[PDB]
């Protein structure tokens, strides 16, 4: 896959991070939230009242 | 050898001077033996109060109809005896007289100019012809589309204030305007601190200051009754006008939304993304390699007839967007694409692409400012809008100073999660309606 | 050498596409590089192509091969889609370049 | 004005995909093999509709519903041997179907080759959860025996377990929710194979010389119609001498005991289709390592387009990768063979050296013998 | 009936024509069929004996087919052989 190799893919990349970091972080959250993950929700301080 | 920099840098400047009405001179020489002299004043169709709506339009008609010390035609027979040009032009807020001519012409034609603006003789009979031949003039401005989207833009976006109304105006005024309210317009807007005696070219300044002097002092300086009239901002309105008509062969769409204005730096970064944009026609020989992607896919797809980007910039207020013209089963295709490059100049620009615009950019600016002609309109509307001629120098530091990341920035400002203005006119049924436009207005990826 | 050389016409038999007439170029796989030289072809080698492939169809068809003296001998298998492929494929690293940097 | 078959848009999409299709003159009867498939799925819907008029899927009347389809409703029997000879003739041309794809370049169609993996999951999860459903004792073993290797996936598997049980072990509400998935299976498969052909039609087919058929195409009527009539007629003749000469030849005796939990067999084996992946899985000696290996076997006939190294599409023209393909072949049957057989030496060593040579020869030799193949044929 | 009769009739006008009718009748029949024996051999033809003639020379019967230029679209000879009869009849 040398087709994306250059700066201009680079620069692509550097832009595009945060969305997909933020984008991730959302997904880890709506796992835990629909899951009720114990090893989270056991942290957080108003969500330990329902255990 | 010379750069860029030093050759930006020997362009000479544009001195500027001010008599005691307030009349702004400015003056820039080069060494052609001709020259271009002209009055900029600061009196549009936003000065205008819907009872006047065509009044400078048709004083812009009337002007060159003889005045009072040059009765008719013979003052357009000493335009003519020395192989002079004569030219007049009124936008919605700015209005021009400019001449071209030799340069030992340079007093008379000042001399001549010092009539238009002061001692213009409107005969009643000259009104009734000019106003047959203003009618007569819409009966043929209303078949070219470009103008007619224009002005619906403009409608649509400015709706309820002065901004919206024509230049040219409605028709009813054109029948009803009588030259009492010319007068009054004349005596209203033409007053000496919103003038500007601009002259490119062959020309002195001290000469041009003296004739300035001799022949321009003493226009007005009073508003007679203590009544100044004020600037007022327009509110901007996301809206949509749709004028279908499916007889027409082709359809034109302009999408828009708020610029910031003469005085925000930002326009020229603005400008810089419109020259990632470009514009495209039919008649283009680049084919498939145009270094645009929405002139690339639209060659690709055979979508639009031609494209265009605009900066229309009107104190602190302006329209920012793209016009195009297409077949009917094309249209949503093409905006589509258009919305897209829009979202990535506010998600991902890359820096070649930045290049790539600011030398288009710089292009465009000096390629411009070539001729007395240009450089004349330069001066006037950098002395009406900005109070000074802003060097090329100038121009070229705020260009060099735009990177990518304040382009994103700049355009995520302007564009991204806008209200549009949209304006059809033409077979537009498969234009899409105001939720798709507003929903093309952001990306859910970011 | 001459070793190597006849053990690739022993390939090219064992291979089996000159029994049904075809040349080396007819049987490449149509990706859009494929496409673009086939589409620069001139219009006898585009017809002759379409043709031999047409034929080789057919005979799949009815799961027969050529006689054997109307085979496509070895040394007058004439790579035709050749140059123009190559002049496709830089064109195409050239725009990759481009558009990579 | 009265050319209905091409005017009502009903029969206008019967025309186009079935009457008007160009389809290559010179495809041969390997690709009868997809058509059989869905008459196959039809007569498997068709049977399992009537074998859902009697059965219960209740754990004290399973067998019992089971031996009384088999005994006194009229031609029970023939319905029951009819389904299971059925799902053993949908797995042969499943075989045939997707070695068809990949000796002729075929899985370069690529939405039409994942839609044709995913068919694949379905198919083989109804056919496992309908083999639970008689509920004799090689049923509920090898149910238990399958949901243990699920267990084996760390930290979530255990829970996952007993939620698809409905339990502690395989027992009433396992029976009767795979009654219900294997009811409601074949439908999906069915929209599937519709999703399938709808991308096929986009794309088009491919013939055995991997060239473009567009200068040599025929209708579909009436030459791919009789043809494939008459692939249904020796599908059947199979078929029916399959259910009325030899019933037992591909079933297992230990399933006509009824379900024991005290009682474990000595050697417990799936169905002959899934042989194959119980013997790549039993060969490395680990769990999660073995489940990855079945998965990753499937997942890797799914990534087969992205390991096409050749400038040709089909192997008619490839000797070097023909010998591969056979030999891999050769690895299938002979890991289909291990998979039947208990862990003795030297059966272990045997199937650890198919699995690894199937794996090689899928990932590693088949691409670099078709570059092998382009320097000799002096393409590049 | 009636556009044969007005057709046989407009095609016999003028010298060129008849004469050439005279030629073609000597050289296929061995005599000049005269117009009155055509009228009469039109008029003794009706809807039953036309259904009967169509049907034995074209109902079931084998085509032959010649075409030139853009023909991809033109069916198959196996096509065209099962449009010489219906289904319905
Ligand atoms: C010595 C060996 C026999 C030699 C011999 O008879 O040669 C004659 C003849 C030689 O063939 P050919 O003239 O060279 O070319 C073949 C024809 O053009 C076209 O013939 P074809 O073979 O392509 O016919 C279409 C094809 C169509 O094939 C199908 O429809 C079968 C599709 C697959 C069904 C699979 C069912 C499930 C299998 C599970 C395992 O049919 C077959 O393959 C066999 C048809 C048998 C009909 C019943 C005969 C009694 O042999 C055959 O046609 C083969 C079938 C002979 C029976
Ligand atoms: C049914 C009601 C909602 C219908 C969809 C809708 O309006 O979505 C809002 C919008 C789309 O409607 P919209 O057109 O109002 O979007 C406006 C978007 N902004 C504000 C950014 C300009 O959808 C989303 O933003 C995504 C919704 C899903 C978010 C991710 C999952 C959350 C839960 C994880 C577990
Ligand atoms: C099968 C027995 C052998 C059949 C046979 O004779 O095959 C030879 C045939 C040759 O075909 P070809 O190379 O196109 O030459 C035509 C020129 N006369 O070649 C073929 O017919 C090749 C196609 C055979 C496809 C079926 C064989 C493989 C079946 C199992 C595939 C398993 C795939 C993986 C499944 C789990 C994952
Ligand atoms: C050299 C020629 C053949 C031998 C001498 C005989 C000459 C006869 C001459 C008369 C004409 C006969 C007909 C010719 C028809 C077309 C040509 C042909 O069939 O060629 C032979 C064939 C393919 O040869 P080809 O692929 O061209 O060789 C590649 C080498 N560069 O096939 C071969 O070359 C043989 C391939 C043998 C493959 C053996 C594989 C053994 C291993 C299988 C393992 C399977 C199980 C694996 C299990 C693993 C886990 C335990
Ligand atoms: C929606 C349609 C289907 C229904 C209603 C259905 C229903 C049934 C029923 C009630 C049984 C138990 C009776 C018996 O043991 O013979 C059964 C068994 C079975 N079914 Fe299905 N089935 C369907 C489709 C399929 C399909 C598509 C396959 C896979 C090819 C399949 C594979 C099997 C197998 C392997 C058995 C076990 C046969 C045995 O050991 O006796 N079924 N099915
Ligand atoms: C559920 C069972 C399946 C059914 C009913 C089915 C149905 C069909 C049908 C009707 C065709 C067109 C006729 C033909 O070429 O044989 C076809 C072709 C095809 N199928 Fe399937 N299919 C099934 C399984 C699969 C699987 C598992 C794969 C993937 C490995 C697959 C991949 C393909 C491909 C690639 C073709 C194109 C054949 C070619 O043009 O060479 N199918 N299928």
């Not at chain 2, 601190?193 to 002092?217: F, I, N």
């Not at chain 2, 055979?302 to 229309?312: A, E, G, P, R, V």
């Amino acid at each position: 896959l040398s087709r994306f190799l250059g700066p201009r893919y680079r620069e692509l990349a550097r832009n595009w991070i945060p969305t997909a970091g933020m984008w991730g972080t959302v997904g880890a959250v709506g796992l835990v939230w629909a899951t009720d993950w114990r090893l989270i929700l056991d942290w957080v301080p108003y969500i330990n009242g329902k255990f | 050898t010379a750069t860029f920099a030093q050759a930006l840098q020997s362009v000479p400047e544009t001195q500027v001077s001010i008599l005691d009405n307030g009349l702004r001179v400015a003056s820039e020489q080069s060494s052609h033996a001709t020259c271009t002299v002209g009055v900029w004043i600061d009196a549009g169709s936003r000065y205008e109060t819907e009872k006047n709506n065509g009044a400078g339009y048709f004083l812009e008609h009337l002007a060159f109809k003889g005045t009072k010390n040059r009765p008719g035609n013979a003052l357009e027979k000493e335009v003519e005896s020395i192989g002079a040009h004569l030219n007049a032009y009124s936008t919605r807020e700015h209005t021009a007289y400019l001449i071209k001519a030799l340069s030992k012409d340079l007093p008379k034609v000042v001399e001549l100019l010092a009539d238009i603006v002061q001692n213009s003789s409107l005969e009643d009979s000259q009104i009734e012809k000019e106003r047959d031949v203003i009618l007569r003039e819409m009966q043929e401005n209303d078949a070219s589309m470009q103008n007619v989207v224009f002005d619906y833009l403009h409608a649509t976006a400015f709706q309820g204030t002065p901004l919206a109304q024509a230049v040219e105006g409605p028709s009813e005024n054109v029948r009803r305007l009588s030259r009492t309210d010319l007068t009054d317009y004349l005596n209203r807007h033409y007053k000496a601190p919103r003038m500007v005696l601009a002259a490119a070219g062959g020309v002195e300044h001290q000469q041009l200051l003296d004739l300035a002097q001799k022949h321009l002092s003493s226009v007005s300086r009073v508003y007679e009754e203590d009544a100044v009239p004020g600037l007022t901002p327009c509110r901007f309105t996301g809206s949509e006008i749709r004028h279908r008509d499916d007889a027409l062969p082709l359809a034109h769409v302009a999408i828009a939304v708020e610029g910031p204005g003469w005085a925000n730096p930002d326009n020229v970064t603005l400008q810089v993304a419109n020259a990632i944009i470009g514009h495209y026609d039919c008649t283009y020989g680049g084919g498939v390699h145009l270094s645009s992607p929405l002139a690339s896919v639209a060659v690709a797809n055979k979508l639009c007839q031609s494209f265009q980007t605009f900066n229309i910039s009107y104190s602190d207020t302006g329209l920012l967007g793209a016009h195009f013209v297409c077949d009917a089963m094309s249209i949503d295709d093409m905006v589509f694409f258009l919305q897209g490059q829009w979202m990535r100049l506010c998600t991902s620009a890359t820096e070649s692409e930045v290049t790539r615009g600011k030398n288009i950019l710089r292009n465009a600016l000096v390629s411009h400012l070539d001729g007395t002609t240009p450089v004349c309109e330069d001066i006037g509307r950098s002395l009406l809008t900005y109070g000074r001629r802003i060097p090329l120098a100038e121009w070229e530091s705020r260009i060099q100073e735009v990177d990518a990341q304040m382009l994103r920035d700049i355009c995520s400002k302007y564009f991204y999660d806008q209200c549009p203005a949209v304006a059809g006119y033409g077979p537009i049924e498969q234009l899409p309606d105001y939720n798709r436009i507003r929903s093309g207005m952001f990306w859910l990826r970011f | 050498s001459k070793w190597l050389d006849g053990f690739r016409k022993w390939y090219y038999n064992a291979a089996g596409f000159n029994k049904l007439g075809l040349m080396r170029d007819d049987t490449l796989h149509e990706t859009e590089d494929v496409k673009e030289a086939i589409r620069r072809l001139p219009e006898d080698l585009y017809n002759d192509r379409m043709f031999r492939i047409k034929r080789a169809l057919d005979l799949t068809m009815r799961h027969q091969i050529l006689p054997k003296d109307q085979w496509t001998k070895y040394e007058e298998d004439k790579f035709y889609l050749e140059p123009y492929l190559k002049e496709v494929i830089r064109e195409r690293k050239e725009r990759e370049e481009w558009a990579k940097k | 004005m009265t050319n209905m078959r091409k005017t009502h848009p009903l029969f206008k999409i019967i025309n186009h995909s079935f009457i008007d299709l160009p389809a290559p003159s010179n495809i041969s009867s390997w690709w009868n093999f997809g058509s059989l498939l869905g008459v196959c799925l039809m007569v498997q819907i068709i049977t399992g509709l009537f074998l859902a008029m009697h059965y219960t899927s209740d754990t004290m009347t399973a067998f019992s519903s089971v031996t009384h389809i088999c005994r006194d409703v009229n031609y029970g029997w023939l319905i029951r041997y009819m389904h299971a000879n059925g799902a053993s003739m949908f797995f042969i041309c499943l075989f045939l179907h997707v070695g068809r794809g990949l000796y002729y370049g075929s899985y370069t169609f690529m939405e039409t080759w994942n839609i044709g993996v995913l068919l694949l999951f379905a198919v083989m999860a109804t056919a496992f959860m309908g083999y639970v459903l008689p509920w004799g004792q090689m049923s509920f073993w090898g149910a238990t025996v399958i949901t243990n290797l699920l267990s084996a996936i760390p930290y979530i598997g255990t829970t996952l377990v007993e939620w698809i049980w409905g339990g502690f072990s395989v027992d009433k509400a396992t029976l009767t929710r795979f009654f219900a998935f294997h009811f409601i299976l074949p439908f999906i498969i069915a929209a599937l194979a519709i999703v399938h052909l709808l991308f096929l039609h986009e794309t088009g087919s491919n013939n055995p010389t991997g060239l473009n058929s567009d200068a040599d195409k025929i209708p579909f009527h009436p030459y791919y119609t009789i043809k494939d009539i008459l692939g249904i007629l020796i599908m059947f003749l199979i078929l029916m001498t399959l259910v009325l000469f030899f019933p037992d030849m591909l079933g297992d005796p230990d399933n006509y005991m009824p379900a024991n939990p005290l009682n474990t067999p000595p050697h417990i084996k799936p169905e002959w289709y899934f042989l194959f992946a119980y013997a790549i899985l039993r060969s490395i000696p680990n769990k999660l390592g073995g489940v990855l290996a079945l998965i990753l076997s499937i997942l890797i006939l799914a990534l087969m387009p992205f390991l096409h190294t050749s400038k040709q599409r089909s192997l008619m023209f490839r000797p070097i990768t023909q010998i591969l393909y056979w030999i891999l072949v050769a690895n299938l049957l002979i890991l289909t063979w291990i998979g039947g057989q208990p862990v003795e030496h030297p059966f272990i060593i045997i199937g650890q050296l198919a699995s690894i040579s199937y794996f090689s020869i899928i990932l590693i030799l088949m691409p670099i013998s078709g570059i092998i193949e382009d320097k000799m044929l002096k393409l590049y």
